[PDB]
């Protein structure tokens, strides 16, 4: 062993909200837990959600976690697994009360419970009438939780490694996960982290494509080092497109704007949502209000200006008592980022890029599944996520609003929860040995010794456009194999590019060639995975195949690292507590 | 600790004010400085006990402020301990010299 | 239309002690872009210049920079704040604190300064709610201008009391989480908070300089927060 | 061992800032001024002698702008002081807008009281 070995029980990759619960419940249960996060924790994509956290608690009205479940199952578009679903419905509750007993400072109604606010894709009694089940503190809800949940890590003792870089996981000769290798930013020191649970946590990986509502740090790190490890993932396919993003900027303004009762006009001023989701209108699922403006714009009927093409997000008529208290964030980001005062003009928006519905798929116990050559899944030994990065799956083809803050503290805390089970269910795992170690260095000694090659920074930026042009709000399947040839091609570029600064004291060049590696991995999997299923389901619209087609689709898509070739996974459709949601057309 | 200091430091700027009225009082509604106007003043009870108070007022409050002013800007320990025993020793001489001063007039 | 930066620069396998160094860069005339921007364009044609970023809407707090002397985010700073014709943009380390490279600072004081404050809630169980502890709007409000802390270490490094004792004065961002814990009506441990402030250092080396509230990018006022705390530190030890 | 950015003069300080500074200095000088003062008041009442030599040395004009600094210095002292103990107690709002405004409301009264105190020499 010629590199430096830290040794605990748990490593988690990643500090955000999944990340940082994760390891307060894991450090809780008595074993040692190494916190590990690219970036200062509490700057996290968390600290920038906005509208809130999605759960049953029935203060604004009498709710159901059964009435979110449904909610949840529909929005997915079906293949949302409803097993997790109901797990995480159900335990939500508890879960949330549980962080505004650590602090979280929730807003309130008069009298003293947390406010909750309508968000999209909410009903009561199974598709009926507006319901308002979105926990919140004003519209920096992602704020509030990620500083409260560093504060108990901080409170808790929690060993953290902030600014160290994970580079790929470490395998031991059984294909089992023993850690990962990584590198510290401010050192430019190489270790090994040793462990018996290695937790990816990564977050999201908006950065594939041009325009993003995502931090610049989403650069699907996990994503890349599953497949490296010759780990799947998991309905790469389903991107989340935000409705509402700055026209011209890609930041966010939260759905919470039309939960509190702002809609969306075309250039004509019809409030097109009626047309297009006559129940739900403006809170329709996302997929759908994001199709409905791009067909308004496509028609000859979005707006334009300094922005670009855009739809008018409306507001004023809330008055300013309540956008100040309700939507002070927003108001921030539309003065900064459009020049618009949303108290006297409507926000100029567009569908961003926003959010990864897939990922490493897993077990409600946050243990990772990769299949066998009969198609079975079986469990990664070692290995976990929670997450953005995990595909449970709880969010299928589409996730509601609300619905993944609540994902990160279930599942991060259920992970933590498990883990003793899981650590004795997969046995003592061998060692690594120190050519298995030196396996997870290849790639970054790989930069480390090109000078001479290409430029990361165009490889990046024709990265970007390809996803964008092609594997946007609306695909074809032209258009779709041709951009997968064009990202076979820039991929190969890529294994030739250079890094120009070489130096070792926090050389932020580096990090970002690494990262490169990662948005090349994920984009790569996500149109091979885009290409393969065609039907139309959420997030995924396809003109060539335009129809819901659930005797052949109503599964995951699953996309195999070591043959780069696709292959299907069931949905679970057995709840446990009450019967399944059977699929049905969806309609808002 | 803390909340001391910063209670006496604003108590003795509220005797040091009264004091600064009562003394800019007298300078700008006497004419001529005779010696002898001059002297009535400094000879009064009231002066005297004012002018000796007015002395302990600014040993507190100065010896705190210069406290506060050499643990910004002087770290060595012993040169530290070494200015703060001047500037007390001066303090306390201010009001020693006061008494003997006005008990001489 | 032409840019000109200067821009502070450090390597400690290079670089003797820091210096400045000069850079240009062509902009569109008709679009006005934000400091964050530029440096990510620069970075482009030298990608040695080191500095830290993520959220580019001003809510991760990674971005802190003295810019023309000023701290506040690069990433909500538009360049047509920072250009005037025939001077050059100056971009330097937030002050105070140890520097890394190039405009990256060593936040670890600062940190160091908030984890002493005990910034977590403090309930000691009694009376426990049935779900959620209830905390009417009246209370909430107390909370507003004090949770929206994003720790970008804009007022602190920009305190001298903070300079001239980065070890014991808290500085304003600390007081000012120490105050969101103090007014929490769900803390129940104010009288042992403010027995651990009521030190010469922890909060009276605030002198209401004001630099604090001059330069807080999300528009916060430690100032104020100082004020109540001192406040609260009489009526309890006075 | 790591630099620091702490070169004063490339760093922008509001006019709060600038008062506050000033405060500290204003302190510092009067500080010494007392001991000055009070061996000129010990001088001027020991005898009839000691006033008339009191006031030839306040005859020169080198002493008269020493006088005059020191004064000054007090003025600003006080005034600024008094400002300080207004926010203090609730007085004057903790806001950067009534801080600015304060401190330059501040500097007039201490430019009135420097010129009264010219007068009175
Ligand atoms: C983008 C966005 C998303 C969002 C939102 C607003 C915005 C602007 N508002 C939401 C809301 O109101 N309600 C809701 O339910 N969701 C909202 N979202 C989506 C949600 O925020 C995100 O999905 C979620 O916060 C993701 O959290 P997660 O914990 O999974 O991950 P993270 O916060 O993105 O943090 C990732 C951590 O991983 C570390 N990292 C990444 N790569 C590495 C490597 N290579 N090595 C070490 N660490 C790594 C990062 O440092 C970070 O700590
Ligand atoms: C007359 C002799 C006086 C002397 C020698 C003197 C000296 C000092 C010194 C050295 C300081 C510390 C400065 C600092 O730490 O920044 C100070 C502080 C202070 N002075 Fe005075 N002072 C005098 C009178 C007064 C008067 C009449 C006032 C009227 C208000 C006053 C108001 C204050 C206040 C409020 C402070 C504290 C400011 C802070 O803590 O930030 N002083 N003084
Ligand atoms: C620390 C402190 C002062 C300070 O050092 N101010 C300052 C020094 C140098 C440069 C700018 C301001 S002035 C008011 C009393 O407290
Ligand atoms: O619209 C938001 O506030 C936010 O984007 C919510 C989720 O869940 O993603
Ligand atoms: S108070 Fe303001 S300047 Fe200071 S750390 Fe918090 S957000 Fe940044
Ligand atoms: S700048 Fe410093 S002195 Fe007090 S008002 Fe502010 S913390
Ligand atoms: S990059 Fe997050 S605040 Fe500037
Ligand atoms: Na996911």
């Not at chain 4, 004009?61 to 020493?66: E, L, M, P, S």
Request: charged fraction near 20%; aromatic fraction near 8%; glycine fraction near 8%.
């Amino acid at each position: 062993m010629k590199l430096p070995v830290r040794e605990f029980d748990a490593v988690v990759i990643g500090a955000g909200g999944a990340g940082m619960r994760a390891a307060l419940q894991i450090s809780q249960s008595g074993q040692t837990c190494a916190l590990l996060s690219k970036v200062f924790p509490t700057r996290s994509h968390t600290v920038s959600a906005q509208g809130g956290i999605t759960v049953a608690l029935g203060n604004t009205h009498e709710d159901n976690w059964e009435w979110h479940m449904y909610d949840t199952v529909k929005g997915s578009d079906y293949i949302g697994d409803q097993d997790a679903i109901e797990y995480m419905c159900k335990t939500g509750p508890e879960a949330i009360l549980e962080l505004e007993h650590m602090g979280l400072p929730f807003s309130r109604l008069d009298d003293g419970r947390i406010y909750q606010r309508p968000f999209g894709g909410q009903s009561k009694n199974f598709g009926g009438e507006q319901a308002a089940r979105t926990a919140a503190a004003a519209d920096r809800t992602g704020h509030a939780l990620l500083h409260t949940l560093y504060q108990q890590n901080l409170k808790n003792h929690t060993t953290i490694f902030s600014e160290w870089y994970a580079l790929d996981l470490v395998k031991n000769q059984d294909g089992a996960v023993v850690g990962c290798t990584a590198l510290c930013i401010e050192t430019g020191e190489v270790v090994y982290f040793k462990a018996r649970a290695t937790v990816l946590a990564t977050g999201g990986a908006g950065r594939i494509y041009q325009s993003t509502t995502n931090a610049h740090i989403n650069t699907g790190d996990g994503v890349g080092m599953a497949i490296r490890a010759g780990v799947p993932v998991q309905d790469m396919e389903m991107w989340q497109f935000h409705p509402t993003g700055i026209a011209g900027a890609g930041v966010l303004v939260t759905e919470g704007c039309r939960g509190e009762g702002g809609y969306l006009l075309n250039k004509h001023g019809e409030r097109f949502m009626e047309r297009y989701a006559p129940n739900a209108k403006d809170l329709a699922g996302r997929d759908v209000v994001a199709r409905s403006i791009m067909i308004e714009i496509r028609e000859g009927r979005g707006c334009d200006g300094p922005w670009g093409p855009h739809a008018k997000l409306k507001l004023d008529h809330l008055g300013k008592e309540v956008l100040e208290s309700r939507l002070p964030g927003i108001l921030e980001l539309s003065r900064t980022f459009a020049h618009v005062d949303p108290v006297k003009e409507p926000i100029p928006v567009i569908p961003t890029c926003h959010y990864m519905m897939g990922g490493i798929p897993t077990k409600v116990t946050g243990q990772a599944l990769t299949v066998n050559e009969k198609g079975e899944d079986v469990v990664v030994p070692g290995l976990f996520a929670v997450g953005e990065i995990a595909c449970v799956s709880v969010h299928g083809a589409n996730r509601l609003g609300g619905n993944s803050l609540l994902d990160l503290v279930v599942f991060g805390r259920a992970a933590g929860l498990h883990l003793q089970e899981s650590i004795a269910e997969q046995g003592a795992l061998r060692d690594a040995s120190e050519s298995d170690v030196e396996a997870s260095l290849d790639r970054l000694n790989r930069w480390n010794n090109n000078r001479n090659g290409e430029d990361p920074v165009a490889i990046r930026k024709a990265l970007q456009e390809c996803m964008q042009h092609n594997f946007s709000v609306f695909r074809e399947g032209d258009a779709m194999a041709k951009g997968l040839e064009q990202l076979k091609v820039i991929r190969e570029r890529l294994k030739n590019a250079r890094l120009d600064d070489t130096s070792s004291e926090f050389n932020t060049q580096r990090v970002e060639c690494l990262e490169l590696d990662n948005l090349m991995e994920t984009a790569y999997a996500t149109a091979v995975s885009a290409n393969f299923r065609t039907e139309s389901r959420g997030a995924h619209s396809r003109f060539d195949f335009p129809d819901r087609d659930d005797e052949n689709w109503l599964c995951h898509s699953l996309y195999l690292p070591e043959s780069e070739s696709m292959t299907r996974r069931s949905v679970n459709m057995e709840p446990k507590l009450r019967p399944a949601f059977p699929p049905k057309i969806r309609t808002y | 600790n803390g909340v001391h200091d910063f209670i006496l430091v604003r108590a003795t700027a509220i005797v040091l004010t009264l004091y600064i009225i009562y003394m800019v009082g007298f300078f700008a509604t006497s004419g001529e400085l005779t010696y002898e106007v001059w002297i009535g003043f400094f000879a009064s009870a009231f002066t005297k006990v004012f002018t000796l108070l007015a002395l302990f007022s600014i040993l507190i409050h100065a010896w705190i402020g210069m406290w506060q002013v050499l643990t910004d800007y002087v770290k060595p320990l012993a040169l530290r301990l070494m200015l703060q025993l001047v500037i007390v020793v001066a303090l306390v001489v201010y009001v020693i010299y006061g008494f003997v001063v006005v008990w001489g007039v | 239309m032409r840019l000109e930066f200067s821009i502070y620069r450090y390597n400690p396998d290079v670089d003797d002690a820091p210096r400045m160094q000069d850079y240009t860069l062509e902009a569109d005339e008709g679009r006005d872009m934000m400091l964050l921007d530029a440096l990510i364009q620069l970075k482009e044609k030298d990608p040695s210049l080191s500095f830290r970023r993520s959220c580019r809407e001003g809510v991760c707090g990674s971005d802190g920079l003295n810019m023309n002397g000023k701290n506040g985010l690069a990433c909500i700073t538009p360049i047509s704040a920072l250009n005037q014709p025939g001077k050059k943009i100056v971009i330097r380390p937030l002050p105070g604190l140890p520097v890394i490279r190039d405009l990256v600072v060593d936040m670890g004081q600062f940190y160091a300064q908030y984890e002493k404050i005990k910034p977590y809630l403090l309930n000691n169980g009694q009376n426990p709610p049935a779900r959620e502890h209830l905390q009417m709007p009246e209370q909430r409000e107390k909370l507003d201008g004090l949770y929206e802390c994003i720790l970008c270490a804009c007022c602190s490094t920009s305190c001298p009391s903070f300079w001239w004792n980065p070890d014991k004065f808290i500085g304003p961002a600390g007081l000012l989480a120490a105050y969101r814990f103090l007014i929490d009506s769900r803390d129940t441990e104010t009288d042992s908070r403010l027995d651990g402030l009521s030190d010469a250092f922890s909060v009276f080396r605030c002198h209401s300089i004001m630099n604090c509230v001059s330069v807080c990018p999300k528009g916060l006022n430690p100032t104020r927060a100082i004020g109540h705390i001192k406040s609260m530190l009489l009526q309890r030890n006075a | 061992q790591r630099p620091v950015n702490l070169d004063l003069q490339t760093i922008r300080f509001p006019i709060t800032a600038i008062a506050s500074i000033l405060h500290r200095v204003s302190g510092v000088i009067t500080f010494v001024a007392v001991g000055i003062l009070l061996w000129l008041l010990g001088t001027s009442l020991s005898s009839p002698e000691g006033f008339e030599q009191a006031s030839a040395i306040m005859g020169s004009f080198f002493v008269k702008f020493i006088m005059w600094g020191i004064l000054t210095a007090l003025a600003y002292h006080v005034v600024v002081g008094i400002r300080h103990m207004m926010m203090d107690f609730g007085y004057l709002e903790e806001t950067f807008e009534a801080g600015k405004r304060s401190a330059k409301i501040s500097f007039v009264i201490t430019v009135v009281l420097s010129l009264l105190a010219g007068v009175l020499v």
